């Protein structure tokens, strides 16, 4: 679970602080990402920890 | 939930596949065919087409 | 018809804190890319705002 302004961090090829410091992707990659928003399920009034 | 359209919760799902690098052991929905042979014919090894 | 344009100069410009500023989607460029903005550098930045 990532938020929307580093969705087009998970790509080969790219830096940042999701795409460098915790989940890099090769520059080979074959596969298929998927992203949806969850904000009616992963969202909290008071914060999320 | 207040907070920006650009900000909001996503899910990520990556799949990754590795190709060409064993015997297929995960493969899609297709039906098999039995083998003929000293014909040419139209092939389909596992997605190798010919 | 009377757009504001900013005069950005004499300073260290660090353009990870923009996506922390807005919560837009895209950050879409045109001559250079996003990622790279940290390591060259340019003689003055306009930014103009509508
Ligand atoms: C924008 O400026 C106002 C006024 O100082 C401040 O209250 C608010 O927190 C600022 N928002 C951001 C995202 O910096």
Do not use: M
Not at chain 1, 9 to 23: C, E, F, L, R, V
Not at chain 3, 26 to 47: E, H, I, Q, R, W
């Amino acid at each position: 679970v990532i938020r929307g302004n580093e969705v087009s961090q998970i790509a080969p090829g790219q830096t940042g602080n999701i795409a460098d410091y915790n989940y890099k992707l090769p520059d080979d990659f074959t596969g298929c990402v998927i992203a949806w928003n969850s904000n009616k399920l992963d969202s909290k009034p008071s914060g999320n920890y | 939930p207040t907070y920006g359209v650009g900000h909001q919760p996503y899910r990520v799902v990556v799949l990754s596949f590795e190709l060409l690098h064993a015997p297929a052991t995960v493969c899609g929905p297709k039906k098999s065919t039995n083998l003929v042979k000293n014909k040419c014919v139209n092939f389909n090894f596992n997605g190798l087409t010919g | 018809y009377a757009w504001n344009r900013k005069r950005i100069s004499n300073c260290v410009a660090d353009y990870s804190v923009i996506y922390n500023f807005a919560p837009f989607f895209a950050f879409k460029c045109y001559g250079v890319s996003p990622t790279k903005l940290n390591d060259l550098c340019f003689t003055n930045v306009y930014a103009d705002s509508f």
